[PDB]
Amino acid sequence: ATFEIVNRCSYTVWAAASKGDAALDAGGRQLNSGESWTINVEPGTNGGKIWARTDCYFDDSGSGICKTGDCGGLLRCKRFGRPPTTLAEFSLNQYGKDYIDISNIKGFNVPMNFSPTTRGCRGVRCAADIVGQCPAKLKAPGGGCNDACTVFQTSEYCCTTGKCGPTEYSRFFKRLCPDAFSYVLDKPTTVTCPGSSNYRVTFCPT
Numbered sequence: 690a691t692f693e694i695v696n697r698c699s700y701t702v703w704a705a706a707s708k709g710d711a712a713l714d715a716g717g718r719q720l721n722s723g724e725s726w727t728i729n730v731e732p733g734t735n736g737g738k739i740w741a742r743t744d745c746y747f748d749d750s751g752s753g754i755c756k757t758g759d760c761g762g763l764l765r766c767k768r769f770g771r772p773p774t775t776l777a778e779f780s781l782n783q784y785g786k787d788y789i790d791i792s793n794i795k796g797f798n799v800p801m802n803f804s805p806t807t808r809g810c811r812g813v814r815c816a817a818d819i820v821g822q823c824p825a826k827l828k829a830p831g832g833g834c835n836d837a838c839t840v841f842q843t844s845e846y847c848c849t850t851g852k853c854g855p856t857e858y859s860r861f862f863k864r865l866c867p868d869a870f871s872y873v874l875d876k877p878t879t880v881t882c883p884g885s886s887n888y889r890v891t892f893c894p895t
Contacts, residue, residue, distance in 0.1 A: 690781055691887045693727045693806065694739060696720035698893035702741040702799060705758060705766040706730070713737055716765035719745075720892070732782045732885060739777040739890050740770055741799040743832060756832045757798040772796040773833030775815060775869075777803040777890045787882040791815045792870040793862040797823075798833035802894035810882035815866035816895045824861055836862070848873035 694704045701721050706713035706728055714728035720741075730737060742758035751764035758770035773796025781787045790813060791803055797819040804812025823834035837858035838847040845853050853874055855863070863871035868878050 690730045690732065690734075690787075690885060691727055691806075692730055692739065693725055693889045694720065695725045695889060695891045696722060696741075696893070697891055698722060698741075698799065700743070702743055702892055703745045703755060703758075703764065704739065704890075704892075705742055705760055705770055706737070706739045707760065707766045707769055708734055708737045709769050710767075712765060712767045713739075716767055717742070717760070717763065719764075730779075730781065735780045735783065737779045737781070738769060739779075739803075740774040741801070741892050742770060742774075743798060757829070772839045773798045773829050773835050775799055775801050775819075777801060779803075779888070781886075782884045785884045787884055787886050788879050789813060789882060789888070790870060790877070790879040791866070791868065793819070793866060794836055794838070794870050794873060796827075796829070796834055796836040796839060797862065797866075799892050800894065802889075802891040804889055804891075805882050805886045806889050807883070807886045809886065810880050813868050813878060813880055814894060815869040816893075817865040819862065819865050822861075822865060824858065827858060827861075846872070 742755040744756035747753035760766035859872035
């Protein structure tokens, strides 16, 4: 499957793509404002994610740091990134269908649209100014708007036992972005697409 990753932000981002235990494609790349990078993701990939990283520095070997979404200091991510990260999440060719969503469960750094470029389903979007509107206690000094699990490490926010409810913090993410997961047990906003669809992830769509 192809994923064109487009940075419409006025700032550089470093795109990242991983399934948690491995890179997808090269795993990451710099995207200056306006740039597009197309990756190939193997059919059947389960639990893939794409995200933006901000404020990165990498040496010539591809090792370094980012302020949001850093993945073990690598340009080319093999693992998931450090919150806060707005997440484009997907599982492909799962009993013949693909499934896509956006999640704020690991916080929000950069607005995003995640849409198919082929027929048969809708896209999803979280493009509101969550960083600007972020509750004081969730603001990350390194940049972005943390989720409450990251900040407070409670069973309720982290849904550790699988029984949690919505919270004042989750409700903030949900109010700003109804179409994204705001906590683990949120009413799903996952979209079913035809198996083997192709996609575009656009940072700063609006």
